[PDB]
Amino acid sequence: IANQPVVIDNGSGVIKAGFAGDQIPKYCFPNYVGRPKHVRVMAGALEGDIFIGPKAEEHRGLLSIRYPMEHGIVKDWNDMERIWQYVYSKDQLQTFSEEHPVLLTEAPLNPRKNRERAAEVFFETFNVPALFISMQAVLSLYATGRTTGVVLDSGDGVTHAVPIYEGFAMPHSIMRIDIAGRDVSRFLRLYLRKEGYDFHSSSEFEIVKAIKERACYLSINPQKDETLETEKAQYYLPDGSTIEIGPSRFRAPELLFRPDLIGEESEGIHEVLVFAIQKSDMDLRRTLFSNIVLSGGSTLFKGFGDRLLSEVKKLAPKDVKIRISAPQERLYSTWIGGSILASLDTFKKMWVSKKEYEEDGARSIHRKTF
Amino acid sequence: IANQPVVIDNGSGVIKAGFAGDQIPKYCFPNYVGRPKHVRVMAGALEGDIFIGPKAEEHRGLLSIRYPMEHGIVKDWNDMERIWQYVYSKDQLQTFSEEHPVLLTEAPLNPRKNRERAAEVFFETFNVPALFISMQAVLSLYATGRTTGVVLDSGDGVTHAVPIYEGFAMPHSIMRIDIAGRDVSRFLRLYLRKEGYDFHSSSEFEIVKAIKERACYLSINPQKDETLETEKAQYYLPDGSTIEIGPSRFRAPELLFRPDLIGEESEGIHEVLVFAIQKSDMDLRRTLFSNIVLSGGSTLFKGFGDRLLSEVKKLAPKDVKIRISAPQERLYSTWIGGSILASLDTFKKMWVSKKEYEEDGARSIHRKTF
Amino acid sequence: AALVVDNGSGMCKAGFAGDDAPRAVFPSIVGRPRHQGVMVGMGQKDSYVGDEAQSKRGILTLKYPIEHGIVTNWDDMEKIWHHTFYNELRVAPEEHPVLLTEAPLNPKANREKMTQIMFETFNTPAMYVAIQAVLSLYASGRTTGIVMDSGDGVTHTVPIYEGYALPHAILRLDLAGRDLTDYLMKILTERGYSFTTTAEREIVRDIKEKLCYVALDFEQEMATAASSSSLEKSYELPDGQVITIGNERFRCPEALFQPSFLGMESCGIHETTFNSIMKCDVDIRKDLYANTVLSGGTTMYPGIADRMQKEITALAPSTMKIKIIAPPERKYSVWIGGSILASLSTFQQMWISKQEYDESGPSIVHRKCF
Amino acid sequence: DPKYADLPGIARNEPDVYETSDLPLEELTSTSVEHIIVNPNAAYDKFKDKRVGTKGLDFSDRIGKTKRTGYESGE
Numbered sequence A, B: 001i002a003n004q005p006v007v008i009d010n011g012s013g014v015i016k017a018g019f020a021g022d023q024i025p026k027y028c029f030p031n032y033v034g035r036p037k038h039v040r041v042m043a044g045a046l047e048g049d050i051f052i053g054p055k056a057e058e059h060r061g062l063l064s065i066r067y068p069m070e071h072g073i074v075k076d077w078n079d080m081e082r083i084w085q086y087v088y089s090k091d092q093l094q095t096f097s098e099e100h101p102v103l104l105t106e107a108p109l110n111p112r113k114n115r116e117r118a119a120e121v122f123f124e125t126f127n128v129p130a131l132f133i134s135m136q137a138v139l140s141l142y143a144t145g146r147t148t149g150v151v152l153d154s155g156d157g158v159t160h161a162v163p164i165y166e167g168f169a170m171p172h173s174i175m176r177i178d179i180a181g182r183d184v185s186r187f188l189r190l191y192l193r194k195e196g197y198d199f200h201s202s203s204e205f206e207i208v209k210a211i212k213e214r215a216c217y218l219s220i221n222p223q224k225d226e227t228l229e230t231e232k233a234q235y236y237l238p239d240g241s242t243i244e245i246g247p248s249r250f251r252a253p254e255l256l257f258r259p260d261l262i263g264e265e266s267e268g269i270h271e272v273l274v275f276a277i278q279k280s281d282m283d284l285r286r287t288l289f290s291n292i293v294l295s296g297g298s299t300l301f302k303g304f305g306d307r308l309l310s311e312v313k314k315l316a317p318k319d320v321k322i323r324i325s326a327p328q329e330r331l332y333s334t335w336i337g338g339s340i341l342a343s344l345d346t347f348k349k350m351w352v353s354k355k356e357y358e359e360d361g362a363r364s365i366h367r368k369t370f
Numbered sequence C: 001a002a003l004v005v006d007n008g009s010g011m012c013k014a015g016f017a018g019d020d021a022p023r024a025v026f027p028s029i030v031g032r033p034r035h036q037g038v039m040v041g042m043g044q045k046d047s048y049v050g051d052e053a054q055s056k057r058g059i060l061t062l063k064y065p066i067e068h069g070i071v072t073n074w075d076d077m078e079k080i081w082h083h084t085f086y087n088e089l090r091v092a093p094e095e096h097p098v099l100l101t102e103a104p105l106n107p108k109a110n111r112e113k114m115t116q117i118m119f120e121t122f123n124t125p126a127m128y129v130a131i132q133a134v135l136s137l138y139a140s141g142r143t144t145g146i147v148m149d150s151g152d153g154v155t156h157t158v159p160i161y162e163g164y165a166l167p168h169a170i171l172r173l174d175l176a177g178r179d180l181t182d183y184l185m186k187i188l189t190e191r192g193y194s195f196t197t198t199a200e201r202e203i204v205r206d207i208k209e210k211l212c213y214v215a216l217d218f219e220q221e222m223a224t225a226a227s228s229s230s231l232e233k234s235y236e237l238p239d240g241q242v243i244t245i246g247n248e249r250f251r252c253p254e255a256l257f258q259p260s261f262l263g264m265e266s267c268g269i270h271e272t273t274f275n276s277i278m279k280c281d282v283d284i285r286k287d288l289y290a291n292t293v294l295s296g297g298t299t300m301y302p303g304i305a306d307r308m309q310k311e312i313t314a315l316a317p318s319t320m321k322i323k324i325i326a327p328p329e330r331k332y333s334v335w336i337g338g339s340i341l342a343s344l345s346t347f348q349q350m351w352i353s354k355q356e357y358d359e360s361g362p363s364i365v366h367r368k369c370f
Numbered sequence D: 001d002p003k004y005a006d007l008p009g010i011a012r013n014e015p016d017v018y019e020t021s022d023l024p025l026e027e028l029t030s031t032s033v034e035h036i037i038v039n040p041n042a043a044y045d046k047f048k049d050k051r052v053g054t055k056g057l058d059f060s061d062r063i064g065k066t067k068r069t070g071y072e073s074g075e
């Protein structure tokens, strides 16, 4: 069917939907299911037992937040079906899923059962004309408009580094670590309890993510800022109460660059970028250092590019040009890539038709992926 | 024929092509077929599964290198066909093969099946008017402009010595040994692993060839330089990392003079030259010792002329005048000879026509070559 | 009275010379704890080693000191040797002379620094380094024949005829047990079961050793794996959780026979064994086909011998008879050889003494290595 | 610019690019060997009027009728 394809980013934190024609995603809402915290027997309470996106944000304190997708993998599929149904609601897009074809953006090196079940839902529950699963990293390059480039895509659920040179992705050089934005939000809650402010509730976890997003700066030297006495910058909560964050502000997102501090066995965001380049062939190393692209929401931390440049330089070889080319629209970069890809006439060949999936089998989605 | 005949020096390391009359070969590119080892995911990436010459040199890290001819013997003919096709393509000379006659330059004492297939490809796949196969040594003498001389042509694939007196070349005094420049690069890689720097990849083997050309000197005394503690001269790799070569610098190129190191029971490059002269008749020995012409790229080693002149003098008779003459363009000397031979009207009689080849077959090529 | 100490990358096999099997066999690892700023409890060792670290895997970051038969961290290797002599064997290193094992074509600094420690740190009376492959032949009571000693660190092919080794015919391949263990993690992550941490990698090695087997026809095995669930076997983790690995069972050891899966762009363990025999002299090839030994624990995969025979036979001539030698004790094939060598009265002379080391230096080892 | 002004979660007053400071034959001069200058134009003239006799030519390993010498004479 010729009618405009619907791009949808499967972001663990925020799913971004919209049409391929639009330069930006019109409808982007948080990826969580909202049910009433108190188990509702009585009338005059929150009805439906389902609150998604803007409806949830309004009555947030009353509801109990449960993320359906963890570490770029779908844990509860029933929840994810309701989320994708809300994408084709009167609230967002307001269209038939049966008419328009779909593009998914699954993280690299995900389970094959995750891709197979994702297709089954979108072909059976929704009567889609055609579906195409793609890598988040490959899209990010289409948006910026360069063929060569390493893509350090720091999402909410997973942070992954994929090196692609002249439209060729080395699949062995891909690096994936689970320590992402959501873990930084979890570790900030621990340090906020060490400052003396508890956020025990699942609703109260959402305002820790807001505190992180508002006020958390990455110091170039962490040891100097610790010895220096903090200003203790006040943050205002939804109720109106003030909280002085203090040293927790800067030593929370540090755990990205040094995850051994809390006690998580991972490489680190500076390390995975360098290791991904060093794993690739010697001839390409210089060009891959010379073309680095930051993607996702967990790069927007104040002074992230400043710290990463410094942490990469000392690990990388001496007298090598390191350009970390961040776009202005890092959060919405992954979708814009899909929107451009979808618009091209080549995409018509790439996607798998509904009749193709019935005849060919299950492999059809996997083999056409690349 | 009005259209100029094309000279193609089918060298193991570098194939040099151009039109007859030209003072230097216009289009000289490395002899290998580059195929992409990494997977293509993005749209707009480098087109084709075959990369040859300068496009392959630029995107070397992406591709897996595969040499078609080894020790002056075409192992894979499908690949040899694609490189000869690339010579006639738009990137290099950019002319039809059917309009221009060809001059091919094979090594001496190669298998007869090689010359037969070389002709079969150049007459059937390309409909060339005329093909003449010639020895590398005979051409090298035309370039320098001398009738008498022994030509020690140390190429990438094979090193051979051909004694030629007043136009005639003595076929029984021809000396050929497989050990050459590419075995020195292979022997250098082995010693670099002993030093503790690994170059397993086919792309990384081209960096070992670059290390050999830049930093490797032949010591005048081998046993002396072995004992003395050497200055560990650092070399900068493409990525930026520094390697200390140390003793492997001077031990690697000694392979040419001592084939026992790699473990092949053959004559040394110094033994090849004197044996070729000593095999020739008593009268001509003094004139051949006086007129020595070095050719090929593997003679460009620092202190090759100094070492050879030392080694030849010991094996040669006492009180004989040994003058080793080097043309400044050692690498291109073979081709320039081809251009001068091709420009002469006598070359018209020397050619094998299509009709002449079609009638007799393989025999016609074997009859007219040396 | 003498000590044999195999310094394998996977497991360190140590014992007394003359004994049938090695006394103490433990995994060669150093376990440093994921410590926070919180104070630690009692009975705390700063760095755990071997069976102790294998018991306390949960918290300790497992760091293999030998990577591809090259000692990266010497301070770590020193702590293993200290656990080997004093704790495991219960013997003074000053009393007994120590035989160590190095893989062939290792960096020269490895053998140099190895012996320096044994002579200075431990103050051993004598020290001899030997090639693992040379020892492995003594196990089978065979002087003649090639060996394919595939270890956890490296795999090497050393052809030895009538008690004389061919050094130039020796070929080293970096593909080994640890690369297969790393490969098995990736394909298990594709199924669903994610293993990231260093402790988890050790559990994946236990899964590999027990279940994984070599298929005769890979394409035929993949067809049966797709259709029927007969090959699918269950394994219980340290946690009560059980996993069904399926087709990935026989997919892991396939990487040995075709490195393209791992993406090394190198010849398989079958093809390198053939290539090594072809590099040797034409006469002796007969006996090397007739006496092809498989050594190390990477040749204890069920049905590797059958697959090895098939692949060699296809490459080798039809007239030749190819017999693969697979003794029951392949894991302890390197050590049991060392025990036979050390016991022989002839070997008493070949030992390098302290007096010999003191006068000459650590460079003496390169002369009296093999 | 006006596209990214519409969206909420966008980088404002931040540098787009984080980059490092932009940092700015031995054998062919040997005594042993005698360096000759290759002039093909001169060489071409010397061989210009030299011909070869391809009549009764056979370089091949053919035993019949004694020894042979390819390229008999010119003119």
Ligand SMILES: Nc1ncnc2c1ncn2[C@@H]1O[C@H](COP(=O)(O)OP(=O)(O)OP(=O)(O)O)[C@@H](O)[C@H]1O
Binding pocket: C006, C007, C008, C009, C010, C011, C012, C101, C132, C150, C151, C152, C153, C154, C177, C178, C181, C205, C208, C209, C210, C295, C296, C297, C298, C300, C301, C302, C331, C334
């Ligand atoms: N029965 C088995 N089946 C399959 N793989 C095995 C088996 N036993 C061990 N392995 C694997 O192969 C490796 C064998 O290591 P081994 O005990 O031979 O020591 P090593 O470090 O390889 O020593 P060396 O290099 O001297 O042989 C193990 O690390 C493991 O990954």
Ligand SMILES: Nc1ncnc2c1ncn2[C@@H]1O[C@H](COP(=O)(O)OP(=O)(O)O)[C@@H](O)[C@H]1O
Binding pocket: A009, A010, A011, A012, A013, A014, A015, A154, A155, A156, A157, A181, A182, A185, A209, A212, A213, A214, A295, A296, A297, A298, A300, A301, A330, A331, A334, D009, D010
């Ligand atoms: N302006 C910001 N400053 C700091 N962190 C941010 C900012 N915006 C988003 N984040 C973090 O990044 C997450 C968004 O990740 P996102 O880019 O949507 O991932 P994905 O690429 O998987 O869709 C948020 O949940 C939050 O943790």
Ligand SMILES: Nc1ncnc2c1ncn2[C@@H]1O[C@H](COP(=O)(O)OP(=O)(O)O)[C@@H](O)[C@H]1O
Binding pocket: B009, B010, B011, B012, B013, B014, B153, B154, B155, B156, B157, B158, B181, B182, B185, B209, B212, B213, B214, B295, B296, B297, B298, B299, B300, B301, B302, B330, B331, B334, D025
């Ligand atoms: N400067 C140099 N020093 C040493 N070796 C060199 C140098 N330049 C080229 N070589 C060697 O010579 C080879 C070139 O051989 P070449 O003369 O082109 O072959 P052929 O004579 O068969 O056409 C290179 O591949 C390399 O091994």
